[PDB]
Amino acid sequence: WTNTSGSCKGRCFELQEVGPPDCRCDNLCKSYSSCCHDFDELCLKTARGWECTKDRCGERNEENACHCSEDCLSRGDCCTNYQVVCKGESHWVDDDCEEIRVPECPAGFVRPPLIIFSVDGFRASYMKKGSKVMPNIEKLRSCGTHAPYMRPVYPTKTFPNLYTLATGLYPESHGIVGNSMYDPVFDATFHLRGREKFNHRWWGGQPLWITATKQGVRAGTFFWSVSIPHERRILTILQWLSLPDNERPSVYAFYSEQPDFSGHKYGPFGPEMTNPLREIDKTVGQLMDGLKQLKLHRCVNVIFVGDHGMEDVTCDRTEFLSNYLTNVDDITLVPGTLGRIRPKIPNNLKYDPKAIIANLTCKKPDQHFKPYMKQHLPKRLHYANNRRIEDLHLLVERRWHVARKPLDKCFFQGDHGFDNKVNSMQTVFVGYGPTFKYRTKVPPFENIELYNVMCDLLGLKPAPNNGTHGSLNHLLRTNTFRPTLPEEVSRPNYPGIMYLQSDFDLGCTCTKGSTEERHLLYGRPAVLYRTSYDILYHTDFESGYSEIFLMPLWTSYTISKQAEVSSIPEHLTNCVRPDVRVSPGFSQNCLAYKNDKQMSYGFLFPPYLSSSPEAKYDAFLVTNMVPMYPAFKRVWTYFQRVLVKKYASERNGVNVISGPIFDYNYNGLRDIEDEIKQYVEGSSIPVPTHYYSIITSCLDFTQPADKCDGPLSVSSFILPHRPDNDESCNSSEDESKWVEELMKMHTARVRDIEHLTGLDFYRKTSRSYSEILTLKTYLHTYE
Ligand SMILES: *[C@@H]1O[C@H](CO)[C@@H](O[C@@H]2O[C@H](CO)[C@@H](O[C@@H]3O[C@H](CO[C@H]4O[C@H](CO)[C@@H](O)[C@H](O[C@H]5O[C@H](CO)[C@@H](O)[C@H](O)[C@@H]5O[C@H]5O[C@H](CO)[C@@H](O)[C@H](O)[C@@H]5O)[C@@H]4O)[C@@H](O)[C@H](O)[C@@H]3O)[C@H](O)[C@H]2NC(C)=O)[C@H](O)[C@H]1NC(C)=O
Ligand SMILES: Cc1nnn(Cc2cc(Cl)ccc2/C=C/C(=O)N2CCN(Cc3ccc(F)cc3)C[C@H]2C)n1
Ligand SMILES: *[C@@H]1O[C@H](CO)[C@@H](O)[C@H](O)[C@H]1NC(C)=O
Ligand SMILES: *[C@@H]1O[C@H](CO)[C@@H](O)[C@H](O)[C@H]1NC(C)=O
Ligand SMILES: [Cl-]
Ligand SMILES: [Cl-]
Ligand code: NA
Ligand code: NA
Ligand code: NA
Ligand code: NA
Ligand SMILES: [Zn+2]
Ligand SMILES: [Zn+2]
């Protein structure tokens, strides 16, 4: 029970959230039906609007939404344009950009406050409109630090992305995996409407306001109800900034439901989009004018950030499951720009997922969605390790929708939620203030990295998250994080020739300085876990061979622009040779591959790229072979025989690092021995879930990859090791029509491979460690 007979006089939007029986006056009191009786009258006043006019200058009526009185500067409740209209001051946007070398804060401000100004559905390309439509935002962008775009997380929806911005976590870790979700342990559904979202049980990880409070830094509200106009949200933030030193927060958030609302109705390029964009710019202007009025415009760090973009999507572009499935009444579909399927009744014995996927696979030539069991989704989405993510997922093609049946002019022209590499899904990032760099453009980056930066801007230690601390140090003038190189746990063994050909009963038949200088360009990768492994040198490649997995953890080799591709001679087709540096007890065997009728093998260093016939014999060593399904070999052989040479010709040589990945529990992390669920028949040779490659070259392509003096250029992938090519609808055609498209879909960051393998790359370069961390977060999108 709450005593609603109390008053909100002198308490409007207070930060101390009182509990029952005291009535509330904070911004969230309406959601819990606990506001005091006069909260709407005293705190949500709108009389005379939000702007001072000439006739209003010089007195005071408490009924006014904001004031134009001489005492309003002391009270901290002027309308944001008061100084401009009444005291001959200029608007912030009309003032020239002046570098902020150090924080210029009034007395009592120990650190520069942070204001996060978040905009829903603000597509990156909206920034190209410029100062014609958005001058305040253009001033922040050109004067501060900006990226051409920021990558959101998948699904590219509001709730997963705002919570990722707050925690630095992937949605699978923070638990907000969609705007709608069913949790089978709670036996409950979370939805935008409804009370379920208010229960803390859904919200995992540690959001910024909690990180701040636990470390003694105060926070303003990060949740604004729709019954509070934007002008009042700005005035409330300004009011809080005027509080006494022991009460004033250091971190604030502003949220706008626009341009997302108008984007859904009119499309991202509808002429109707101009007005909501100008209204967001005027809100930014009100904030900067109010900060200038407070002498805080050269003190506060401001982040202008979006959650996701917006794409043209209409009713006319909808695929229906009833066209592929006999029974859509027995399944529940979370629909739209993604699909998540589960039986209507949990654990229904008649649910046949194998038969459902089969019916949704390559059934139409222009099929505008692709089904996946969640562990088969591209690893860069990081969208599998949560009980709220249904096993069956549909990746929807951009501009399309998926629905259960036709019943479910269009009422909408825009939507979002698609794969986070889609261009229309990219959003904005601008940092402005004393701690951000001046007039600096930075490369595009992922929104999971912002939590570390916001913690840096506030002097906070971030809770464990998925950002790479130090990868965004180039955005900041000061408060950079001093990253520390991860300690190598296992030191390599360097075995010499110790065995004879006669020591092996495997059922098989058939210049270290120069190797390191040519094929290991950035030093040996560090093994960050306890294991036994051997460095093996060869003329054409170097490898880190695992005694536990019986295969390389990594294989490193350089292919120059003028390297020649050769064929495997007919007499060497089935050649596998024992390695006299590795014990028969620590080797794979050919008998297990012959016994396993579904599993064949491939090589990490390709025999096709040997530098000479004599050197080609090393490519056939048992220590260079890895288990591969014949369907996968079509992909791997095309990559090794055609694509590597193509990349070497285009990038002026390439350094390739390839190897296996074991991620049976789809958690994005290296499996321990116990978690590996498949082995080559009758053996202890584990079967990889994926195969990776990291392809590095010189950013200045006029210098060969093996003689590069400056920054590096990287592209990587994590290919699913699957027994069929069902993901590629055109895989009956020659590999030149489908393999590269499959690889582009499975593009990856080097950081994604490090998590999945327990290895640490680029340990020996002439580049700063912060630059290397940025290179490790790079994702080549092919957009
Ligand atoms: C992205 O970054 C995150 C954060 O660093 C990494 O996630 C962490 O992974 C490690 C290793 O697997 C986990 O450690 C284990 O933790 C448990 C104890 O876990 C409890 O306590 C911690 C600490 O307070 C808490 O964070 C945990 O929170 C999880 O569970 C909550 C209840 O279900 C849930 O509300 C919350 O969202 C979160 O769920 C996620 O994690 C669990 C696994 O912990 C997972 O099953 C679920 O599906 C979600 O993904 C929890 O209350 C110890 O008993 C173990 O011994 C071990 O220490 C961390 O718990 C985990 N932290 C988070 C926040 O997820 C990711 O690996 C990294 N991803 C990549 C790809 O690098
Ligand atoms: C979702 C998510 N995750 N974190 N946030 C916080 C947030 C974080 C950052 Cl980095 C920047 C800005 C914001 C602010 C967001 C915001 O004001 N709204 C309006 C209210 N609704 C509804 C609501 C949900 C749960 C509740 F308990 C109460 C209400 C959520 C959101 C759209 N939102
Ligand atoms: C509680 O509410 C009643 C009116 O419903 C009021 O008379 C009472 O004084 C309030 N409590 C306090 C402690 O003032
Ligand atoms: C799959 O489609 C066929 C028609 O091609 C239909 O006979 C069958 O019932 C469908 N199966 C499921 C599980 O929907
Ligand atoms: Cl919450
Ligand atoms: Cl196929
Ligand atoms: Na994700
Ligand atoms: Na402060
Ligand atoms: Na070496
Ligand atoms: Na794993
Ligand atoms: Zn949104
Ligand atoms: Zn939306």
What would the DSSP string read from start to end of 643-688?
IHHHHHHHHTSEEEEEEEE--TT-SSSPPPGGG---BSTTSS-BPP
CB-based pocket (< 6 A), ligand 4: 325-326, 352, 355-356, 359
In ligand 2, the atom with minimum distance to the C-alpha of 120 is 32
- Give the DSSP H/E element, type plus range, for residue 320: strand 318-320
Annotated binding-site positions for 1-hexadecanoyl-sn-glycero-3-phosphate:
158, 179, 260, 416
- Coil, helix or strand at residue 378: coil
CA distance 572 to 680: 23
Pairing relationship of beta strands 251-259 and 414-415 according to DSSP bridges: unpaired
Work out the widest C-alpha separation in the chain, in whole angstroms. 103
Tell me the CA distances in angstroms from 116 to 294, 432, 433, 453, 677, one per residue in order: 18, 11, 12, 12, 45
Ligand index nearest the alpha carbon of residue 3:
3
Tell me the CA distances in angstroms from 139 to 102, 130, 131, 135, 430, one per residue in order: 19, 9, 8, 6, 10
Closest CA to 149 of 426, 355, 362: 426
d(CA 173, ligand 1 centre) in Å: 6
CB 423 within 8 A of CB 783: yes
CA distance 627 to 634: 13
Pairing relationship of beta strands 654-661 and 690-698 according to DSSP bridges: antiparallel
Beta strands in 36-165 (DSSP E): 114-120, 145-146, 150-151
Closest CA to 224 of 214, 232, 213, 216: 232
**∠ Cα 773 147 777 (to 5°):** 20
Tell me the CA distances in angstroms from 20 to 8, 33, 69, 112, one per residue in order: 15, 11, 37, 35
Q: Name the residue at shortest CA distance from atom 9 of ligand 1.
A: 173
CA distance 152 to 420: 6
- Give the DSSP H/E element, type plus range, for residue 181: strand 181-183
d(CA 465, ligand 8 centre) in Å: 24
CA distance 284 to 289: 9
Annotated binding-site positions:
120, 158, 179, 260, 264, 307-308, 416, 663, 665, 667, 669, 671
Sequence-ordered list of residues with C-beta below 8 angstroms from that of 236, at least 6 positions apart, any chain: 13, 27, 228
**∠ Cα 104 109 112 (to 5°):** 60
- Give the DSSP H/E element, type plus range, for residue 120: strand 114-120
CB 311 within 8 A of CB 270: no
Q: Which residue has the tokens 């502003």?
A: 254
- The 8-class DSSP code of residue 778 comes to -
CB 536 within 8 A of CB 579: yes
CA distance 333 to 190: 15
The identity of residue 685, as a single letter, is I
Q: Which residue has the tokens 């253009």?
A: 138
CA distance 676 to 689: 9
Closest CA to 451 of 436, 465, 431, 432: 465
As a dihedral over the C-alpha atoms of residue 602, residue 604, residue 609, residue 612, rounded to 10 degrees, the angle is -90
Tell me the CA distances in angstroms from 782 to 51, 348, 697, 743, 779, one per residue in order: 47, 41, 17, 10, 9
Is residue 420 packed enough to be buried (19+ CB in 10 Å), middle (13-18) or exposed (0-12)? buried
In ligand 4, the atom with minimum distance to the C-alpha of 326 is 14
Closest CA to 655 of 568, 755, 554: 554
If one residue of 321, 322, 324, 325 were mutated to test the ligand 4 pocket, choosing by the most ligand atoms within 8 A of its CB, it would be 325
CA distance 508 to 604: 18
CB 716 within 8 A of CB 694: yes
CA distance 433 to 143: 9
CA distance 83 to 292: 9
CB 711 within 8 A of CB 771: yes
Q: How was this structure determined?
A: X-ray
| Ligand 3 touching residue 736 (CB < 6 A) | no
The identity of residue 498, as a single letter, is M
The identity of residue 591, as a single letter, is L
CB 326 within 8 A of CB 355: no
Tell me the CA distances in angstroms from 407 to 165, 312, 665, one per residue in order: 36, 21, 38
Closest CA to 250 of 115, 113, 451: 113
CB 584 within 8 A of CB 505: yes
d(CA 662, ligand 10 centre) in Å: 7
Task: State both tokens at 212.
Answer: 């701040």
Residues paired with residue 276 on neighbouring β-strands, in sequence order: none
CB 306 within 8 A of CB 141: no
Annotated binding-site positions for Ca(2+):
663, 665, 667, 669, 671
Beta strands in 683-763 (DSSP E): 690-698, 712-720, 747-748, 759-760
Residues paired with residue 691 on neighbouring β-strands, in sequence order: 660, 719
- The 8-class DSSP code of residue 462 comes to P
CA distance 182 to 190: 6
Residues with Cβ within 5 Å of ion ligand 8? 111, 113, 250
CB 119 within 8 A of CB 420: no
The identity of residue 550, as a single letter, is L
If one residue of 359, 362, 363, 404 were mutated to test the ligand 4 pocket, choosing by the most ligand atoms within 8 A of its CB, it would be 359
CA distance 744 to 380: 11
CA distance 668 to 757: 9
Q: Where are the alpha helices (DSSP H) in 257-377?
A: 260-266, 274-293, 353-360
- Coil, helix or strand at residue 705: helix
- The 8-class DSSP code of residue 78 comes to B
d(CA 731, ligand 6 centre) in Å: 4
The identity of residue 77, as a single letter, is D
- Coil, helix or strand at residue 141: helix
Q: Structure resolution in Å?
A: 2.0
- Alpha carbon 387 to its chain's center: 20
- The 8-class DSSP code of residue 297 comes to T
Task: State both tokens at 138.
Answer: 């253009």
State the sign of the Cα–Cα–Cα–Cα dihedral 269, 274, 275, 280: positive
> DSSP secondary structure string, 159-177?
HHHHHHHHHS--HHHHS--
Phi, psi dihedral angles at 296 (to 5 degrees)? -115, 0
Is residue 750 packed enough to be buried (19+ CB in 10 Å), middle (13-18) or exposed (0-12)? buried
- Secondary structure percentages of the chain, helix, strand, coil, to 5: 30, 20, 50
CA distance 430 to 160: 20
Closest CA to 541 of 656, 694, 461: 656
Beta-carbon-side half-sphere exposure of residue 524 (alpha carbons within 13 Å):
22
CA distance 105 to 114: 13
CB 514 within 8 A of CB 649: no
If one residue of 2, 4, 5 were mutated to test the ligand 3 pocket, choosing by the most ligand atoms within 8 A of its CB, it would be 5
Is residue 343 packed enough to be buried (19+ CB in 10 Å), middle (13-18) or exposed (0-12)? middle
In ligand 1, the atom with minimum distance to the C-alpha of 205 is 64
- Coil, helix or strand at residue 733: coil
Task: State both tokens at 773.
Answer: 């961390």
The identity of residue 13, as a single letter, is F
Domain carrying residue 635: 501-777
10 Å Cβ neighbour count for 768?
A: 13
CB-based pocket (< 6 A), ligand 1: 169-170, 172-175, 204-205, 382, 385-386, 464-466, 668-669, 755
> DSSP secondary structure string, 390-449?
-SEEEEEPTT-EEESSTT---S-SEE--S-TTSGGG-B-EEEESSSBPSSEE---EEGGG
- Give the DSSP H/E element, type plus range, for residue 319: strand 318-320
d(CA 679, ligand 10 centre) in Å: 16
CB 540 within 8 A of CB 618: yes
Residues paired with residue 712 on neighbouring β-strands, in sequence order: 698
- Alpha carbon 299 to its chain's center: 30
Task: State both tokens at 586.
Answer: 């620590």
- Alpha carbon 74 to its chain's center: 44
Angle between helices 769-777 and 750-757 (to 10 degrees): 90
Active-site residue, selected from the candidate residues 158, 164, 221, 765? 158
CA distance 149 to 644: 30
Sequence-ordered list of residues with C-beta below 8 angstroms from that of 570, at least 6 positions apart, any chain: none
State the sign of the Cα–Cα–Cα–Cα dihedral 742, 743, 747, 748: positive
Is residue 767 packed enough to be buried (19+ CB in 10 Å), middle (13-18) or exposed (0-12)? middle
Q: Name the residue at shortest CA distance from atom 6 of ligand 3.
A: 5
Q: Which residue has the tokens 């069929």?
A: 724
Does residue 236 carry a catalytic annotation?
A: no
Q: Which residue has the tokens 């409007």?
A: 12
CB 285 within 8 A of CB 431: no
> DSSP secondary structure string, 237-265?
HHHHHTS-TTT--SEEEEEEEEEHHHHHH
CB 543 within 8 A of CB 535: yes
Phi, psi dihedral angles at 426 (to 5 degrees)? -70, 150
CA distance 414 to 267: 4
- The 8-class DSSP code of residue 582 comes to S
Tell me the CA distances in angstroms from 161 to 268, 431, 469, 517, one per residue in order: 19, 18, 19, 44
| CATH number where 550 lies | 3.40.570.10
CA distance 602 to 472: 39
Residues paired with residue 748 on neighbouring β-strands, in sequence order: 716
Annotated binding-site positions for Zn(2+):
120, 158, 260, 264, 307-308, 416
d(CA 420, ligand 7 centre) in Å: 8
Task: State both tokens at 4.
Answer: 């609603």
- Give the DSSP H/E element, type plus range, for residue 696: strand 690-698
3-state secondary structure 438-458: CCEECCCEEHHHHHHHHHHHH
R_g (Cα) of the chain, nearest Å = 30
Task: State both tokens at 682.
Answer: 């009758």
If one residue of 163, 170, 173, 465 were mutated to test the ligand 1 pocket, choosing by the most ligand atoms within 8 A of its CB, it would be 173
As a dihedral over the C-alpha atoms of residue 370, residue 376, residue 379, residue 381, rounded to 10 degrees, the angle is 40
Tell me the CA distances in angstroms from 630 to 497, 570, 662, one per residue in order: 33, 19, 19
Tell me the CA distances in angstroms from 655 to 74, 226, 313, 577, 644, one per residue in order: 64, 53, 41, 25, 10
CB 491 within 8 A of CB 532: no
Q: Name the residue at shortest CA distance from atom 49 of ligand 1.
A: 173
Task: State both tokens at 426.
Answer: 């990219």
10 Å Cβ neighbour count for 595?
A: 14
Ligand index nearest the alpha carbon of residue 299:
8
CB 554 within 8 A of CB 564: no
Q: Which residue has the tokens 């935002």?
A: 137
> DSSP secondary structure string, 493-552?
B---S---GGG--SS----HHHHHHHH-TT-PPEE-SS--EEEEE-SS-EEEEETTTTEE
CA distance 523 to 516: 8
Closest CA to 504 of 393, 580, 397: 580
Phi, psi dihedral angles at 574 (to 5 degrees)? -100, 20
CB 35 within 8 A of CB 66: no
The identity of residue 622, as a single letter, is V
